[PDB]
Design a binder for this molecule. Structure first.
Ligand SMILES: *[C@@H](C)[C@H]1/C(=C/c2[nH]c(/C=C3N=C(/C=C4\NC(=O)C(CC)=C4C)C(C)=C\3CCC(=O)O)c(CCC(=O)O)c2C)NC(=O)[C@@H]1C
Ligand SMILES: *[C@@H](C)[C@H]1/C(=C/c2[nH]c(/C=C3N=C(/C=C4\NC(=O)C(CC)=C4C)C(C)=C\3CCC(=O)O)c(CCC(=O)O)c2C)NC(=O)[C@@H]1C
Ligand SMILES: *[C@@H](C)[C@H]1/C(=C/c2[nH]c(/C=C3N=C(/C=C4\NC(=O)C(CC)=C4C)C(C)=C\3CCC(=O)O)c(CCC(=O)O)c2C)NC(=O)[C@@H]1C
Ligand SMILES: *[C@H](C)[C@H]1/C(=C/c2[nH]c(/C=C3N=C(/C=C4\NC(=O)C(CC)=C4C)C(C)=C\3CCC(=O)O)c(CCC(=O)O)c2C)NC(=O)[C@@H]1C
Ligand SMILES: *[C@H](C)[C@H]1/C(=C/c2[nH]c(/C=C3N=C(/C=C4\NC(=O)C(CC)=C4C)C(C)=C\3CCC(=O)O)c(CCC(=O)O)c2C)NC(=O)[C@@H]1C
Ligand SMILES: *[C@H](C)[C@H]1/C(=C/c2[nH]c(/C=C3N=C(/C=C4\NC(=O)C(CC)=C4C)C(C)=C\3CCC(=O)O)c(CCC(=O)O)c2C)NC(=O)[C@@H]1C
Ligand SMILES: *[C@H](C)[C@H]1/C(=C/c2[nH]c(/C=C3N=C(/C=C4\NC(=O)C(CC)=C4C)C(C)=C\3CCC(=O)O)c(CCC(=O)O)c2C)NC(=O)[C@@H]1C
Ligand SMILES: *[C@H](C)[C@H]1/C(=C/c2[nH]c(/C=C3N=C(/C=C4\NC(=O)C(CC)=C4C)C(C)=C\3CCC(=O)O)c(CCC(=O)O)c2C)NC(=O)[C@@H]1C
Ligand SMILES: *[C@H](C)[C@H]1/C(=C/c2[nH]c(/C=C3N=C(/C=C4\NC(=O)C(CC)=C4C)C(C)=C\3CCC(=O)O)c(CCC(=O)O)c2C)NC(=O)[C@@H]1C
Lengths: 172, 162, 162, 172, 162, 172
């Protein structure tokens, strides 16, 4: 996997190039904001069960056919599998935020997931809806102004949203 | 690629778990180290051509046979001198990458993995490169935390060659 | 799905062999048990709506807070009461399936696998369902071999919740 | 795998339905005939080697190109493989009769077998001929009136034939 | 298919290595053995129909019941006699292949693998074939190194049947 | 795998035929030339590192884009992989010469290699160039008149070349 620093290195190495002054300054900006990045990881991690439960409750309220008899999330075994999938996707999203790069999420979670769901008959578009609901829940928790030093996390929340959006796109 | 951040993720992922406070503290330590390392990378980068020119000449001085003996492996021809300058340029560039990455990943992935097999196959002496690296260590012109950082990665490469 | 017949096949297949006299004797025992179990399934089926209505009221009586406290997990709203009645209906239907199957397979596959994770995630108390099941056990109105059969599966579910 | 009882349960569960009085009466009919069902399993099992040998002898009499040099069942290794395949298919057919459902035969034997044979160059249409010859041999043995209490097994023999026919269809 | 050459390659390949002097010496030994074995194969080949006719008659003499008893497994019919002559022809042809191959590979791959299962399934007596092979051993008309070679493979087949 | 002797046997067995007098005489010719065949194996084996290094040096001189930053053989890891591949192909070619048959090279090295390279983004046409350069180097070494009893190895060198050419064809 890559992190933000080694993503820049790898792109430069492909070109046989030194990392530019502009690229290094962009990495210094990431470093300067590192405490806020770690708050995002910490808050989502500490509230993972709530994010998954609230997203699932929203998904099944919008798509009752998933939980009706014959639905893909009907029976406790299938519901448990579905909750586990949402928790897995959330875990890899927290790794992407920590590292500042999507490579771990692509390589260890999303690559081949569409085909996996197609073969199981898991409705990918409904997984994408659940992922979008986890995004809303996770941003609400991560971006809660209570109990943190006040300041701007807008960039980090957009980056966090991008990782959820990449997951939703990979399964739909 | 190995960095303190990728190592932390790999650890958590190996255990099927979310990141812990210990891994967030690893990231804080990497962030504290970063701005000096990113300065060292800036320093080395602006001096790279000078350092490559100098390290090449230091190898040729210590091992004069490399400039005179005939053979595919020697800098006794223009194309041989160009291969040598290129290789020395690779070490300098990849050490700058380590200062950006905050760890040995770039050296490990791009240069050290396979290094022994390549030096054997193409009959390149590791001693030539160790001399180029001692020169780079003496002439990079950094001090304080940047210099410790840069020297850690130069010593790691010398150790890989020895 | 686990039944005496599928278990016998799984055993033979695991050993790469044809079925033995022991497995044919298992089938004979399942066939002897079946017609009473199939009668119990008929009994429970005709009383299912009554038993679900009664078991819901018994849970609400024992845990009055479930009808009053605000929260996604409570029967204090119409949609909460409907979720609860639905869930109790699931237990009754799946216990009838066990009487048809001649074993716990339907409960294992459709309800018990994942039950702890679901109750934790959605903050449902296992004690609520144990109360619904004690009611069903007291009011199914079966006796003799049917009742022993039905009670075996109700006790299995109570044990899964405890 | 499913048996006859859990096939009915699974179909009902998909619909969120109780098993109907009609379905339960149909299962009671299976139960009432259970001794005859077990005789079918017992007789085929006890005569498995004879059923395989007689089917193979018939197949090779009709299709001598299989056993000529260059044929797919020429050499003892290939003949042994072919006999083993017939024995495997017969074993899974006996499991289907025992359980009163084809799921074990589909899931553990037939699913992917056509593609397996295509890749090996095993002639599936000739396997189907061997399976049809095992069907004739097995019914003759299972439906032998000697040494059993007299009565009607016509339904069971049709069901047994259906499992062989499903195997023959899956490889041709 | 097992030969001294394929065995040597399999050994080297199993160890991820190039062939050694020991494997080249195996090949030299196989080459020294070959021209006599290739002569024996020529001998047996020109006498094959005669040897098959004779070995069949020797089996029928020792086991007269094979020509008289009714049954799918017996040479009491034209098609049974033809199966028997065919089978005896297979042993002779595949033993000639062993003399060409320089080892048991052809017998192992084409005849011995599965032999016990086939003889059991089709109720063929191994003793019938052992008699056919004793005849072939006594009547092939080879001597010296060819005969030792041929007899090694005939004895290997008799041992496989016993 | 087959050797020259068992290739002839296998073809005869498919036909239910005895190996012909002509085929046996052709095998006797191989046997008579066996010392020369073993010299080819011995010389390539003893000079394997030189053959690989010289072929690689030639390939990269002709195709500098392979070793430029971003090229498939740039970085020591990728160069080491590339050298290892050339050594593997050379090893299986020496096995084919030893046995007098390509089956080991096809079965254990070439079968599926094109698809393997396609999936990795290894340029098969450039592998084929390296293999052709190993062929030139190996023939020069194998066919060196110094330090061997003088005689004609033309047939063996053509056979050796055929194994390299088969490898080059399998990856391009
Ligand atoms: C957007 C995410 C919200 C936000 C973030 C924010 N945080 C800080 C400051 C800090 N954050 C931390 C984080 C941690 N401390 C720990 O002990 C751990 C566990 C190991 C973590 C993850 C720290 C250490 C700091 C600095 C000390 C402090 O608490 O002030 C800021 C301030 C700016 C900065 O980068 O320091 C901000 C803005 N603030 C908001 O209002 C958003 C909702
Ligand atoms: C069609 C298959 C043929 C047939 C069957 C048939 N069988 C019975 C009765 C029984 N079959 C058994 C079976 C077994 N007894 C054992 O000990 C074992 C091994 C564990 C087996 C498989 C048994 C116990 C009975 C009952 C006792 C008896 O032998 O009579 C019947 C009678 C009807 C019934 O269901 O009982 C029939 C019809 N009969 C035919 O004529 C068909 C050729
Ligand atoms: C083409 C390949 C070149 C060539 C070959 C050639 N070799 C021989 C003779 C021999 N080769 C060997 C080989 C080995 N001896 C060993 O000890 C080992 C290691 C185990 C090997 C591989 C041997 C034993 C002989 C015979 C003894 C000898 O050295 O003379 C010949 C002669 C013909 C023959 O088949 O004997 C030839 C032609 N000769 C050339 O000029 C080619 C360049
Ligand atoms: C009734 C005793 C009490 C009660 C019930 C209640 N349950 C839910 C939600 C769920 N219940 C289940 C259970 C099952 N689903 C299955 O597939 C099966 C097996 C076939 C069972 C037993 C599940 C999975 C859920 C969550 C998903 C869904 O909504 O279906 C709720 C709603 C909880 C929420 O957060 O939305 C309620 C209220 N609550 C009480 O207070 C009663 C005493
Ligand atoms: C929940 C929102 C939806 C849903 C999910 C669902 N998933 C499965 C089964 C699987 N899910 C995965 C996914 C992964 N496995 C991994 O290790 C990773 C990380 C690389 C992922 C993301 C896999 C492999 C499976 C199959 C194997 C398994 O169950 O462990 C199910 C079960 C399907 C079944 O038929 O058993 C379900 C229900 N279903 C919904 O309806 C939601 C839209
Ligand atoms: C002759 C010694 C006695 C005899 C022979 C007999 N054999 C068969 C049938 C078969 N024999 C074989 C043997 C082989 N098949 C192979 O592929 C090979 C290796 C290349 C061998 C050695 C096999 C497999 C069969 C069965 C299938 C087939 O028909 O080919 C029969 C017919 C048996 C039957 O049930 O049809 C007979 C009669 N029988 C005697 O009494 C002779 C003394
Ligand atoms: C006999 C009627 C025909 C015949 C058969 C034949 N089959 C093979 C090889 C294989 N058969 C299977 C089948 C299965 N494996 C299993 O585990 C199962 C149950 C799930 C089945 C049904 C497989 C996997 C193989 C390949 C591996 C193996 O041999 O174990 C052969 C051998 C082919 C070869 O080239 O070696 C043969 C000859 N051939 C005929 O001509 C008949 C029509
Ligand atoms: C300079 C100190 C001495 C010298 C150099 C020399 N090197 C080569 C050839 C190669 N050097 C490398 C090294 C690398 N390739 C990489 O991808 C990396 C990491 C990014 C490194 C460090 C390699 C792989 C080669 C061989 C392939 C190629 O040509 O690039 C040569 C040419 C050797 C030849 O046989 O052609 C030379 C001359 N030689 C001296 O005498 C100097 C003192
Ligand atoms: C060298 C001329 C060219 C080149 C080669 C290259 N290959 C790889 C990677 C692999 N090569 C193989 C090949 C084999 N594996 C085996 O076991 C066998 C024998 C059956 C063969 C022939 C495989 C499987 C791989 C992938 C796995 C591995 O690396 O072990 C690489 C590395 C690619 C990467 O991205 O890591 C390279 C560079 N590249 C060139 O540019 C030359 C044209």
């Amino acid at each position: 996997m890559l992190d933000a620093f080694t993503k820049v290195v790898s792109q430069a190495d492909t070109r046989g190039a030194y990392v530019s002054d502009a690229e290094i300054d962009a990495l210094k900006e990431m470093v300067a904001a590192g405490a806020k990045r770690m708050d995002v990881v910490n808050r989502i991690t500490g509230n993972a069960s709530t994010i998954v439960a609230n997203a699932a409750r929203g998904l099944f309220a919008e798509q009752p056919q998933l939980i009706a008899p014959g639905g893909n999330a009907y029976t406790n075994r299938r519901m448990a599998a579905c909750l586990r999938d949402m928790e897995i996707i959330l875990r890899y999203v927290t790794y992407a935020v920590f590292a500042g790069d999507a490579s771990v999420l692509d390589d260890r979670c999303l690559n081949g997931l569409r085909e996996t769901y197609q073969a199981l008959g898991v409705p990918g578009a409904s997984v994408a809806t659940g992922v979008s609901k986890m995004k809303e829940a996770a941003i609400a928790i991560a971006n809660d102004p209570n109990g943190v030093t006040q300041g701007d996390c807008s960039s980090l929340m957009a980056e966090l949203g991008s990782y959820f959006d990449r997951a939703a796109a990979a399964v739909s | 690629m190995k960095t303190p951040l990728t190592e932390a993720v790999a650890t958590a992922d190996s255990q099927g778990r979310f990141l812990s406070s210990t891994e967030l503290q690893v990231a804080f330590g990497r962030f504290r180290q970063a701005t000096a390392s990113l300065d060292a990378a800036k320093g080395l980068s602006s001096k790279a051509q000078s350092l490559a020119d100098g390290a090449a000449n230091a190898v040729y001085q210590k091992f004069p046979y490399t400039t005179q003996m005939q053979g595919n492996n020697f800098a006794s021809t223009p194309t041989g001198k160009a291969k040598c300058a290129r290789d020395i340029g690779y070490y300098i560039r990849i050490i700058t990458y380590c200062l950006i990455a905050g760890g040995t990943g770039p050296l490990d992935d791009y240069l050290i993995g396979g290094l022994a097999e390549i030096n054997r196959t193409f009959d390149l002496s590791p001693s030539w490169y160790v001399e180029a690296l001692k020169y780079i260590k003496a002439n990079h012109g950094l001090s304080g935390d940047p210099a410790v950082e840069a020297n850690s990665y130069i010593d790691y490469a010398i150790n890989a060659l020895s």
